[PDB]
Amino acid sequence: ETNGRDHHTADLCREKLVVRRGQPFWLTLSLTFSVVTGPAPSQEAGTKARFPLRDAVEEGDWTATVVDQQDCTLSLQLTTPANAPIGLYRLSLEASGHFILLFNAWCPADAVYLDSEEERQEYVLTQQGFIYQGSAKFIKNIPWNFGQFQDGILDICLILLDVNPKFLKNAGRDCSRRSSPVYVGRVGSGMVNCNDDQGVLLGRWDNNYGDGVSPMSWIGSVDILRRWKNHGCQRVKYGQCWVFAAVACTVLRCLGIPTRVVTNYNSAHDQNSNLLIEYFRNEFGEIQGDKSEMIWNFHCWVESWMTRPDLQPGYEGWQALDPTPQEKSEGTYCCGPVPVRAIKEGDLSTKYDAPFVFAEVNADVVDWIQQDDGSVHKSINRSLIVGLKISTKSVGRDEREDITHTYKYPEGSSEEREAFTRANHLNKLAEKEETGMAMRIRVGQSMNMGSDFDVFAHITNNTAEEYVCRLLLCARTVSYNGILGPECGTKYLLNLTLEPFSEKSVPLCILYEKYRDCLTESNLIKVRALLVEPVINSYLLAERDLYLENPEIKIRILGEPKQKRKLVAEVSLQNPLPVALEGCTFTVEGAGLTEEQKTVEIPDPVEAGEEVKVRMDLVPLHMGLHKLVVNFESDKLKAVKGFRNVIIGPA
């Protein structure tokens, strides 16, 4: 067990040994040792090893040097190789139990070696985190309990590997190839939503999740992974991209591959890696429906840290893995791993799937306004820029780290030019037409889910001429992935006089009664404004995605935070709606604060102004920092999150 403390697997080391490859582990008792892992072990396949109880050393692969011999006892040290395959091993010796071997971010020779402690702590050990959502212009951080070290998750991850397509075809090859984080990476990734029989989650995007758990409701990977195994490995209802990435992160972290979930705003996902996306809108600026895919408000994927021996030297580091399956050249599958640096450099020939990730982040959009006589005019749209605020949690702290710079060079820089050339993407001549006029959507201040509020189409005329235009404003609810719902606010002005060297601000009132019916749990509304000057026949387009704020969840920690001691969390919130909330339910969890997810229903409805308050009983079994993540659910106010860091010291 003091191996746990040595291998950073302490929480995992309870009633079975679990260690990390490339590092020596204590064992206490001429004879020889033998290890076997797969269901068809073999010597050359690395899945089986025979080694003597020497006294010297001479590394190479597996060794078992002796250290002490306290008369009736015998202390020795087994050493696994830095590239030993991952999995369950059987340990037996000959005259004259089992351990689980994971990747080792701490071992210099391991392919997943992490140069610094804080990063190993964050990307492998810390079980709580954030998934960035909201909007490019108002980023929200959703708390999430990865809980990779929660009870039974490691066993589920091994089951997850042992049931993947490649293990079914040839269990022997699979177990052997599991020495490679890129190989394990592609498996973890494909098992999340792709591989439709044994897949972990079943995606659904239509806002109709009654017969399952809505994607926005999950507050951690643990419950998903459990519902999967406890129902014979059947897809859990339901997930969406951040959920896929989130459980993929949990699995990979459990297994020891440093991983972090990333969010990209204005993501050109599900376009066939196409770098020039065109939309055709009618005279009110409404995109003319069909087979065209909308830009996603945000899209999530994960990044895993490892070396890439299967590619040109120098591509070690972060590798982008997108477990959300997308339409590809020959089928619909997930993507990666591809080195992020390759994406930044425009090296699209690198495996795997470089052109897809490159597009998510660099695609170019053209908005056309179709008119009478089928004439088509290119509108100026300065509001849309693909690949916006690539975010992931900072190492060791709750602040958000912007990693956009790792995927892209500064706009219009020379290095950007190089990358775009290497990617056959020199399209960026910029129309710059500039009617001298500009326009953008302004919000003024934060709005809350449940309230009425004004937003504004803000026009700037930095010219000597006075224009007379028509301005078409339209606001409609949107799913996080682009699906537009019905209009929830419209306004047109047919004779807008824009004075010279001035600015005008036109308000658009958005009412709760108009957006309550179709707003998804992502709380997004998309405001659109089209300004057209009939003389020159110019079209100025501007759009913005608003995020309506949910009420905050107050969290009081009652009692002294000590290991193995009653802890009460009082959670509450105030109903923001002008009507009553029914079926209120608080849900809580967090690796380190409970082994079980806690739930508390509220029998009676919470009226319009009222607050709802309950107390959850916790029994924290671990010292150190842990995030208590909480979710609130009701009939008319869903998926409101909240969290609280709890320290918990010595008993």
Ligand X SMILES: Nc1nc2c(ncn2[C@@H]2O[C@H](COP(=O)(O)OP(=O)(O)O)[C@@H](O)[C@H]2O)c(=O)[nH]1
By CB under 6 A, name the binding residues for ligand X: 135, 137-138, 442-447, 546-547, 549
Beta bridge partners of 483: none
Q: Which of 39, 314, 396, 609 binds a second copy (CB under 8 A)?
A: 396
Instruction: Return the active site residues.
Output: 241, 299, 322
Looking up tokens 């302004």 gives 442
Q: Which of 39, 152, 444, 500 binds a second copy (CB under 8 A)?
A: 500
Stretch that binds a second copy, among 25-33, 248-256, 301-309, 390-398 (CB under 8 A): 390-398
> Of these partners, a second copy, ligand X, none, which one is at the site of residue 278 (CB under 5 to 8 Å by kind)?
none
Beta bridge partners of 440: 458
Q: Which of 2, 29, 385, 501 binds a second copy (CB under 8 A)?
A: 501
Is 439:544 a contact under the CB 8 Å cutoff?
Answer: no
> Of these partners, ligand X, a second copy, none, which one is at the site of residue 26 (CB under 5 to 8 Å by kind)?
none
Beta bridge partners of 320: 303, 338
Query: Shortest gap between Cβ of 98 and a second copy (angstroms)?
Result: 28
> Is 132 flagged in the annotation as binding?
no
What is the rounded CA–CA span in Å between residue 228 and residue 202? 11
What is the rounded CA–CA span in Å between residue 318 and residue 58? 33
Angle at 123 between CA 122 and CA 127, to 5 degrees: 65
Q: Which of 163, 557, 600, 614 binds a second copy (CB under 8 A)?
A: 557
What is the rounded CA–CA span in Å between residue 150 and residue 372? 63
Give the interface size with a second copy as a residue count (CB under 8 A): 26
> Is 600 flagged in the annotation as binding?
no
Query: Shortest gap between Cβ of 235 and a second copy (angstroms)?
Result: 38
Query: Shortest gap between Cβ of 448 and a second copy (angstroms)?
Result: 16
What is the rounded CA–CA span in Å between residue 573 and residue 592? 24
Question: Counting contacts by CB under 8 A, is residue 503 touching a second copy?
Answer: yes
> Is 5 flagged in the annotation as binding?
no
Query: Shortest gap between Cβ of 455 and ligand X (angstroms)?
Result: 8
Looking up tokens 């053209």 gives 366
Question: Counting contacts by CB under 8 A, is residue 650 touching a second copy?
Answer: yes
> Of these partners, ligand X, a second copy, none, which one is at the site of residue 444 (CB under 5 to 8 Å by kind)?
ligand X
> Is 546 flagged in the annotation as binding?
yes
Looking up tokens 């699906």 gives 483
Is 303:319 a contact under the CB 8 Å cutoff?
Answer: yes
Q: Give the burial string for 241-280 (b: 16+ CB within 10 Å, else e).
A: bbbbbbbbbbbbbbbbbbbbbbbbbbbbbbbebebebebe
Question: Counting contacts by CB under 8 A, is residue 117 touching a second copy?
Answer: yes
DSSP string, 585-635: EEEEE-TTT-SS-EEEE-SS-B-SS-EEEEEEEE-----S-EEEEEEEE-S
> Of these partners, a second copy, ligand X, none, which one is at the site of residue 647 (CB under 5 to 8 Å by kind)?
a second copy
Residue numbers of the site for a second copy (CB under 8 A)?
116-118, 396-398, 499-505, 556-560, 623-625, 644-645, 647, 649-650
Return binding residues. Answer: 362, 364, 401, 411, 416, 440-447, 503, 544-547
Return binding residues for GTP. Answer: 440-447, 544-547
Return binding residues for Ca(2+). Answer: 362, 364, 401, 411, 416, 503
